[PDB]
Ligand binder design. Structure first.
Ligand SMILES: CCCCCCCCCO[C@@H]1O[C@H](CO)[C@@H](O)[C@H](O)[C@H]1O
Ligand SMILES: CCCCCCCCCO[C@@H]1O[C@H](CO)[C@@H](O)[C@H](O)[C@H]1O
Ligand SMILES: [Cl-]
Lengths: 182, 4
């Protein structure tokens, strides 16, 4: 009956805890603890290449990111196992974060590069390997596209980490090409 | 901050 596996569940708990902390302590204070290394002296605090994905600055995006995390990530963990979801998550957070700060610096956050990796991965893995038992529904492809399109044309009030989203998508596509050559 |  329960849809979310342990990894799916633990990532949602972490995001909520961080989000609470950003209300109590404020956004900037948490960014300093968790953002991508913003100084050379912090290049070995290894959590920071991943913990940027846990911070949200707006209610609307924590909602939608956790929604597709819960749905897509939940599907990957249930059909492909926990470790597989873990790997997609870590690599996508790493590389999306890399491409983002390269062209825009380190002050970004959100779990959406990981989400876009999951979209791409679920999708292409279903397209190229239907036996796997995962598939990106058409309704979702549309919702995803509109959301992306909104981000890229700035239809939210916010500043968007587009590099990280497109990077994220790319990673998930690549991983699914590899995985689907069995 | 920029969101992803
Ligand atoms: C505005 C863009 C259009 C949005 C439409 C998105 C359709 C989302 C489909 O997800 C559905 O979720 C349900 C459980 O959560 C299940 O019935 C089913 O397994 C799944 O297919
Ligand atoms: C498939 C689920 C439907 C999602 C419902 C939430 C829609 C997102 C709301 O966006 C907001 O809407 C206003 C009018 O569009 C803009 O003026 C505003 O700047 C923007 O922040
Ligand atoms: Cl956000």
């Amino acid at each position: 009956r329960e849809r979310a596996g342990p990894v799916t569940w633990v990532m949602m708990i972490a995001c909520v805890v961080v989000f609470i902390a950003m209300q109590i302590l404020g956004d900037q204070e948490v960014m300093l603890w968790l953002a991508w290394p913003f100084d050379p002296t912090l290049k070995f605090e290894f959590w920071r290449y991943f913990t940027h994905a846990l911070m949200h600055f707006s209610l609307m995006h924590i909602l939608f990111n956790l929604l597709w995390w819960w749905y897509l990530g939940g599907a990957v963990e249930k059909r492909l196992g926990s470790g597989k979801l873990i790997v997609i998550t870590l690599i996508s957070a790493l590389l999306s974060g890399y491409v983002q700060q390269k062209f825009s610096g380190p002050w970004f956050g959100g779990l959406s590069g990981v989400v876009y990796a999951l979209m791409g991965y679920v999708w292409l893995r279903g397209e190229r390997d239907p036996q796997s038992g995962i598939y990106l529904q058409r309704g979702l492809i549309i919702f995803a596209l509109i959301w992306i399109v909104a981000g890229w044309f700035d239809l939210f009030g916010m500043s968007m980490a587009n590099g990280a989203h497109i990077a994220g998508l790319a990673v998930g596509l690549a991983m699914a090409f590899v995985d689907s050559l069995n | 901050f920029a969101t992803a």
